[PDB]
Design a protein around this ligand. Sequence first.
Ligand SMILES: CO[C@H]1/C=C/CCN(C)C(=O)C[C@](O)(C(=O)NS(=O)(=O)N(C)C)c2ccc3c(c2)N(C[C@@H]2CC[C@H]21)C[C@@]1(CCCc2cc(Cl)ccc21)CO3
Length: 155
Amino acid sequence: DELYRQSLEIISRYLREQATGAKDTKPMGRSGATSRKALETLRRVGDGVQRNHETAFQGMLRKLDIKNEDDVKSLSRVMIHVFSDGVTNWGRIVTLISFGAFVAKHLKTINQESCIEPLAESITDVLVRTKRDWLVKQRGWDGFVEFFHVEDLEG
Ligand SMILES: CO[C@H]1/C=C/CCN(C)C(=O)C[C@](O)(C(=O)NS(=O)(=O)N(C)C)c2ccc3c(c2)N(C[C@@H]2CC[C@H]21)C[C@@]1(CCCc2cc(Cl)ccc21)CO3
């Protein structure tokens, strides 16, 4: 399952990088160039989403009350409720992942760093297993990269 593997890698790295503030230096697995550009896009676009919706993000985090492993495991049901049961576009996928990074940073702050990789798996499961058809039709991570590609300005 190349799409799942690639998705997990991109999401995991972003969540870890967001939580730790440090870049993972290991190479990507398969489809390295796309996965690298995908991660770079998420850095650009995801950070803005978290700031543009700061207050709503804080409010949802406070409402969820995430303390431990069992609370983190309960999030997949909420993700299916909010994300899966609605229209699909790249914007809503960025929000799924950006709120994930927001939860990841919270987990670091309460010393629950070990729950981050499970969280990343849960997000990936929801994204890939409920939206595979849409993702394939939109060209997967190549389509993601192409969608958010910004052309250089004329100097
Ligand atoms: C009102 O607060 C919202 C913020 C909305 C601003 C962004 N916006 C305009 C959206 O439309 C985001 C949205 O696509 C969405 O549908 N939001 S909404 O249902 O609440 N409503 C249409 C605004 C949208 C798309 C995808 C979302 C999602 C919202 N979640 C709820 C967001 C996090 C703060 C909640 C967050 C959520 C659901 C909550 C649990 C969770 C946990 C993880 Cl680890 C990752 C994601 C999520 C599902 O992912």
